[PDB]
């Protein structure tokens, strides 16, 4: 009677997604992790709060050291992919990408085997490239796969704007597309407080500072935690995407999506994932909005595109060599 | 305009409490931790999710490496104490109790200095003894201090019953008083599904199994996590206590509370904290309910009483030895 | 995509149920009424609050003057029957019973014609008899039909107890079975505050006054409104039953249910609807709990049974006369 | 304690506001109405649903045929004024305005007497003029009074756009200021779906249709209800204003607000209430945003201003011959 969501990865991010989905009563939640005991423990800890919170859900966790346990994903409406590494001492983010692509390949093949009907929300960073790897490995029709990106950048951008202007978080709207960091592309003219353009409220230098803080917002958290990365804001940023699919909400949120056909004319890429505004519903990507760029936005977009093309070619090379 | 809650400790439990209070919109939340960056990081990560969740709250974090930062607790309606250690099989429970009592002493001294008007919710285990230590150190009127105990044991007990009977978590009621583990005292006769006693619904053998799992429920999670203890279920168990104070809900939940006067005739302890059913309101403990014990419950209670008396005497001795 | 609920009757009670289901995001909601414009108006008014409340739901209303509009019920998981008429004195309530039985016959035939797969929650008073009429008219398997009764009496009883004792409404449990008014049968021994029996907390004289107030709680509201009856508390009392079906919650709540087989040995009625504790799930009634009556409860139950047997015979006679 | 809200008027709108505040747990809610039994009945019906909904609030109702019952407003953080005269046949719009101004005088005087510290949210239509009457009658500092307008027009406009574009209600933003009907002034250029201008999504003819439907949105519901006016969407539209004050959320929403000083240079009125974007906080109006008009908007605004000047002049004339 209820929708089913699987979460792959039971670390801080995946477990936060699971706890968030339970609070928001999105559906039954099954958690998966290769680490002995981890997914089972997170699921139980989350489930044990149900009598206080009020959620009547089936919440379970499984160890995938025996990959056969991936069979428990069967019937999932959405699978959230959060498995993967963060940098180890002596690892470039270039080495990290390659490592994570390999994990995506394994995960995608498991999804293909046990739950090929699911829509997929890919979280592992950079999620545009990891969504691409999931697509290549799973064979799932590409409109059914989306990557986390803009939901998180926009929530940070809104937070900073709201604090600066001393207004409710609900009334700030901050428009971003593309990736994280230098690949992020804000449309300041589309950012506002209850419709009032930010450019009518803050001077350029202040907006610039806020844009910068947003670009490096993940690193800001890493520098505070020292030994881990953000998970609270990512968790809810992911959950709002998931629930839009499960409950067919038709939220319009920038996410990493597969660009093809007429959309390639606007976004200057073809057959790749990159962050663009999408309508999210029961079928996955229900619509890609084609934006109109001014010159600054276009030049910024071109840089973002080159980074994605570069990293996607790396994923291509990996799959070509590892049948 | 909003109430203010301070959370001392920004590890898994304290930060979960903070995120939980934010979701339930309990009030502004200030987080404190001796580890540089940690409380600020947890606060920012939680705050950055505000635009998606919808909470319009001030959420801040501070480093207490210098105790002067505790000045930021000023005007807190509730302070949640989650500071303290868990050494694991290296030193005994006794060494651990002593370590934590010392932490409560310094925390309580800081509370007296910077926010002596606050109600306190003590989480550090065993919370009855740690509440007693907070009382001795802070000088706060003892009705204004409560310890986490029954809120958590009861949520676990209810989860297990509901799954065994395949019923809503909302309709299961599980009655426990006393401490954790062998110090916990269930009243099976007061446990029911929508009023129907559980003894009419399950074989005694199964009820005993569920009682034992509840006793060692925290250990069950520790085994699954390997390197840490439960935090999700404790987080909401703590938040329901905090919000009952802040919003004067008059919840009736078993918590560690100070027993004196006529209540000592019922609970056989005097001037100590122990887990009993209390009405929780804006003034802290607004009523202690005096239970009638049957013979089995009485026996079990007396054992719990001896444990609390013994550990409380250890706390007295520590305080006597340290001015 | 989403679950669908139809509400028949767009008066105060039906429209309150609709707005309640929307707020609680239970599913898409279609409203039906014979009165031109009424259901369409209630639906639009409710839908137009969606941007503030947050519910992304399809909410529509239809006039059933042309009965073919009932085709819009197709695919409903649950249908709520609130259609009915009139008052207590003035005209005879026996005359009223017959009139409402006739409306149930028409509504039941429409359901069989257009949405025979739905579970049905019957609200029209007395809902035990009206559920019986829906069953006779619709041919729907009887476990898939339940009547409002206990959910509303228990919420009133809980309210009165919580006010008297100055405790949270969440922690009061009040046990009733049977019908309304003199037909209601409280189990004082199964009523408690967080497990503590109310007999341990209030003088018997007070409990008796509260029981009497619950019996005549509907009349208390009529006395205040003058020209109408209660709708806010009924609305939520109905919605918790509906959502238990839609979301398969397994709530345990007393409702009017079809009593047969071994249950007839406990409840002394056979092949009739009467208020008993049931587990409510995606299949409708998933369990009837068989209580053990003490002498006093049994004597009260026999009276309630006699009233239901009499009125069910009247319903039988009506159907026999109009086949 | 908890925050307290008084609601004056226990008809459909006032009682809907009360039930909405309860569900949203905004604070204690006291309802007042001159008609014997009505406020008491609405309050009790609402309170009796608390055990199911979960709100632990003091909800009470009083009949103000005895004026002294207004003493029960004491300590209210916000007072919501919904009392008004139902328009009688043959009564002109100006005659209705005069009657309602008279009711605002009585209400304002009771507020001045019994709860002069309150912020006021005025609902009685037209709320700009009625806010102005409440100001004249109560002597309350005018930044502490706001009138319902744009919150309701915006929610309707958002509903229509979301349905037309098949997107989530959460992501549509519809910018309006001024009054209702022909006094409403939309800024199409500030209306968008997740930042994407609606002028990039819909052609002018479709946008015009939706603007027009919004202008006469109230009338559309009246034509469906036939015997009354909208209340569900107004209820939540009001409640979001009220909770922004009580919980100091700093929502930015167009409301009727007192225009003076520098703001008069932008809005072309002085010392009158008219609908403009405001930041709503614990002090009432925390900020008025000064918009930049194009020619169409300026001309439409001048019309809106003239209507407000004319009706405010009628109010001045009324107060001048009654004191």
Swiss-Prot record, chains A, B, C, D:
Family according to the record: Belongs to the LDH/MDH superfamily.
Binding site for substrate: 87, 93, 125, 156
SUPFAM superfamilies referenced in this protein's UniProt entry, alphabetically: LDH C-terminal domain-like (SSF56327), NAD(P)-binding Rossmann-fold domains (SSF51735)
Record GO biological process: lactate metabolic process; tricarboxylic acid cycle
Reaction catalysed by this enzyme: (S)-malate + NAD(+) = oxaloacetate + NADH + H(+)
Matching InterPro entries: L-lactate/malate_DH, Lactate/malate_DH_C, Lactate/malate_DH_N, Lactate_DH/Glyco_Ohase_4_C, Malate_DH_type3, NAD(P)-bd_dom_sf
Protein task: Catalyzes the reversible oxidation of malate to oxaloacetate.
Coiled coil: none
Oxidoreductase found in the keyword field: yes
Top-level taxonomic group: Archaea
Residue positions of the active site: 180
The protein's name: Malate dehydrogenase
Stored Gene3D superfamilies: Lactate dehydrogenase/glycoside hydrolase, family 4, C-terminal, NAD(P)-binding Rossmann-like Domain
The keyword Ligase belongs to this UniProt entry's keyword annotation: no
GO molecular function, a single term: L-lactate dehydrogenase activity
EC identifiers of the protein: 1.1.1.37
UniProt keyword terms in alphabetical order: NAD, Oxidoreductase, Tricarboxylic acid cycle
Annotated HAMAP family: Malate_dehydrog_3 (MF_00487)
Family annotation (Pfam families): Ldh_1_C (PF02866), Ldh_1_N (PF00056)
Binding site for NAD(+): 9-14, 33, 100, 123-125
Species whose genome carries this gene: Picrophilus torridus (strain ATCC 700027 / DSM 9790 / JCM 10055 / NBRC 100828 / KAW 2/3)
């Amino acid at each position: 009677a209820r929708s089913k969501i699987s979460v792959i990865g039971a670390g801080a991010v995946g477990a936060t997604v699971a706890q968030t989905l339970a609070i928001r009563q999105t559906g039954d939640i099954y958690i998966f992790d290769i680490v002995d005991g981890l997914a089972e423990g997170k699921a139980l800890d989350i489930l044990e709060g149900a009598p206080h919170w009020g959620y009547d859900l089936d919440i379970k966790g499984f160890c995938t050291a025996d990959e056969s346990k991936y069979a428990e994903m069967k019937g999932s409406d959405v699978i959230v992919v959060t498995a993967g590494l963060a940098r180890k001492p002596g690892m470039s983010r270039d080495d990290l990408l390659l490592k994570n692509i390999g994990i995506m390949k394994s995960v995608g093949e498991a999804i293909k085997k046990y739950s090929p009907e699911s829509k997929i929300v890919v979280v592992t960073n950079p999620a545009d490239i990891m969504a691409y790897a999931i697509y290549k490995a799973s064979g799932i029709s590409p409109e059914r796969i989306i990557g986390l990106g803009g939901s998180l950048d926009s929530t940070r951008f809104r937070t900073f704007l709201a604090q600066e202007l001393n207004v409710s978080f609900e009334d700030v709207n901050a428009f971003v597309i593309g990736g994280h960091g230098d690949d992020m592309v804000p449309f300041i003219r589309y950012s506002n407080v209850s419709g009032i353009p930010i450019e009518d409220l803050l001077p350029r230098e202040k907006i610039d500072e806020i844009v910068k803080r947003t670009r490096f917002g993940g690193g800001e958290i890493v520098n505070l935690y020292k030994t881990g990365s953000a998970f609270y804001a990512p968790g809810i940023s992911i959950a709002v995407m998931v629930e839009s699919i499960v409950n067919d909400r038709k939220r319009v949120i920038p996410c990493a999506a597969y660009i093809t056909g007429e959309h390639s004319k606007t976004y200057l890429v073809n057959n790749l994932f990159i962050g663009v505004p999408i309508k999210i519903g029961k079928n996955g990507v229900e619509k890609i909005y084609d934006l109109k760029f001014n010159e600054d936005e276009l030049e910024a977009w071109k840089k973002s595109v080159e980074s994605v093309k570069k990293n996607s070619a790396i994923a291509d090379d990996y799959f070509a060599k590892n049948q």
